[PDB]
Write an enzyme that holds these catalytic residues in place. Structure first.
Site, PDB file in Angstrom:
ATOM      1  N   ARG A  48     102.865  38.983  44.569  1.00  0.00           N
ATOM      2  CA  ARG A  48     103.554  39.577  45.686  1.00  0.00           C
ATOM      3  C   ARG A  48     103.652  39.045  46.961  1.00  0.00           C
ATOM      4  O   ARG A  48     104.121  39.046  47.835  1.00  0.00           O
ATOM      5  CB  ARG A  48     103.238  41.024  45.558  1.00  0.00           C
ATOM      6  CG  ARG A  48     101.865  41.327  46.062  1.00  0.00           C
ATOM      7  CD  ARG A  48     101.263  42.994  45.782  1.00  0.00           C
ATOM      8  NE  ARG A  48      99.985  43.123  45.311  1.00  0.00           N
ATOM      9  CZ  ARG A  48      99.072  42.981  45.805  1.00  0.00           C
ATOM     10  NH1 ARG A  48      98.873  42.399  46.938  1.00  0.00           N
ATOM     11  NH2 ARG A  48      97.857  42.865  44.994  1.00  0.00           N
ATOM     12  N   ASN A  49     102.258  38.296  46.776  1.00  0.00           N
ATOM     13  CA  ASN A  49     101.861  37.570  48.267  1.00  0.00           C
ATOM     14  C   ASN A  49     102.419  35.860  48.177  1.00  0.00           C
ATOM     15  O   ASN A  49     101.367  35.148  48.690  1.00  0.00           O
ATOM     16  CB  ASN A  49     100.575  37.829  48.451  1.00  0.00           C
ATOM     17  CG  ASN A  49     100.003  39.419  48.965  1.00  0.00           C
ATOM     18  OD1 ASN A  49     100.927  40.057  49.303  1.00  0.00           O
ATOM     19  ND2 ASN A  49      99.014  39.707  48.490  1.00  0.00           N
ATOM     20  N   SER A  99     110.773  48.347  54.693  1.00  0.00           N
ATOM     21  CA  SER A  99     110.227  49.105  55.563  1.00  0.00           C
ATOM     22  C   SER A  99     108.946  49.976  54.816  1.00  0.00           C
ATOM     23  O   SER A  99     109.172  51.226  54.398  1.00  0.00           O
ATOM     24  CB  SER A  99     111.324  50.578  55.943  1.00  0.00           C
ATOM     25  OG  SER A  99     112.185  49.650  56.810  1.00  0.00           O
TER      26      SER A  99
END
Ligand code: AQ4
Length: 312
Positions: free
Chosen positions: A146-147, A25
């Site tokens: 991170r991607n 989240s």
């Protein structure tokens, strides 16, 4: 004189998928984990569901749809693809579940079990995905560990097209606007002129490679984003990761040349890392390089097992 994008955008009924748990989240909304069960067939498809916060945002709504547009327009084994969208209170993007999460955290919680073959194969795979994007005339704009998601330890894919821009036919570069791009992964010309190109992506590919070879380190751990432009102007660059032969480090350094055309092309990075992948240990020096399995829990190499120590 431009080719019509005949990609199919699929609208999926919210009744067709069962959410099961939130994966994260962050300050963008939330990413869920679930199962997509198309009514007709007899198949259960593990998926990831991405949406915004409960309240409807003006510009954020357009942005998800922009991201949907690019994800629906790419089809490659090393690029994450959109399965469809679900029009709820807020739009939800649905994609294939990458069980092992992002590559950055993956190398971090597995350092002691990541051998040279895996590192080099990821560099090849990421280079293939990127070359594909280039063929599609797409400039990533946020390539970083991170991607990159992990389907399996042997199969990764590029994701997060939030900043991706498609270039025209006779268009050579994209001129940005607002400041919302991660500085420590961008070419110098990007920071100085807001210019982005496929070659700009190569710089980011270099940094991404550095994150992997260092097992997840933060580039320029000390230095704050404001200084990065200057240290780069002085000719400074990321350091040679301890496990890196000069051969590999020379690849990372080349992606960081000032003249963008001097940097290698994704198609060349593929060839280069592919050759090295055929003989891993000649290019990366890692203590274990297998597994490194009787937990001594001590710092001793003169240890000998009792059934090998006979009558003194
Ligand atoms: C649409 C879309 C879209 C756009 C950008 C990114 C993603 N992300 C993912 N897509 C698919 N599978 C994911 C799985 C994930 O599990 C991570 C932990 O691994 C045990 C995961 O982690 C979320 C961040 O917190 C860790 C992200 C996944 C989806």
């Amino acid at each position: 004189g431009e080719a019509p994008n005949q990609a199919l955008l699929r609208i999926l009924k919210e009744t067709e998928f069962k959410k099961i748990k939130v994966l994260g989240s962050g300050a963008f909304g939330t990413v869920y984990k679930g199962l997509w069960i198309p009514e007709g067939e007899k198949v259960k498809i593990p998926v990831a569901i991405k949406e915004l916060r409960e309240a409807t945002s003006p510009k954020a709504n357009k942005e998800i749809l922009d991201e949907a547009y690019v994800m629906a327009s790419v089809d490659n084994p090393h690029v994450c693809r959109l399965l469809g969208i679900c029009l709820t209170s807020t739009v939800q993007l649905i994609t294939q579940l990458m069980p092992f999460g992002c590559l950055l955290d993956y190398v971090r919680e597995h350092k002691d079990n990541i051998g040279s073959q895996y590192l080099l194969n990821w560099c090849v795979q990421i280079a293939k995905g990127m070359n594909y994007l280039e063929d599609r005339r797409l400039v990533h704009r946020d390539l970083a560990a991170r991607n990159v998601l992990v389907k399996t330890p042997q199969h990764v894919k590029i994701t997060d097209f939030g900043l991706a821009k498609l270039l025209g036919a006779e268009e050579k570069e994209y001129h940005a606007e607002g400041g919302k791009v991660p500085i420590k992964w961008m070419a110098l010309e990007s920071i100085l002129h807001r210019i982005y190109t496929h070659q700009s992506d190569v710089w980011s590919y270099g940094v991404t490679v550095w994150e992997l070879m260092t097992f997840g380190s933060k580039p320029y751990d000390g230095i704050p984003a404001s200084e990065i432009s200057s240290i780069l102007e002085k000719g400074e660059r990321l350091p040679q990761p301890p496990i890196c032969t000069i051969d590999v480090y020379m690849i990372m350094v080349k992606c960081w040349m000032i003249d963008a055309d001097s940097r290698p092309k994704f198609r060349e990075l593929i060839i280069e890392f592919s050759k090295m992948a055929r003989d891993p240990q000649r290019y990366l020096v890692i203590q274990g390089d297998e597994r490194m399995h009787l937990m001594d829990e001590e710092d001793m190499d003169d240890v000998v097992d009792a059934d090998e120590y006979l009558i003194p």
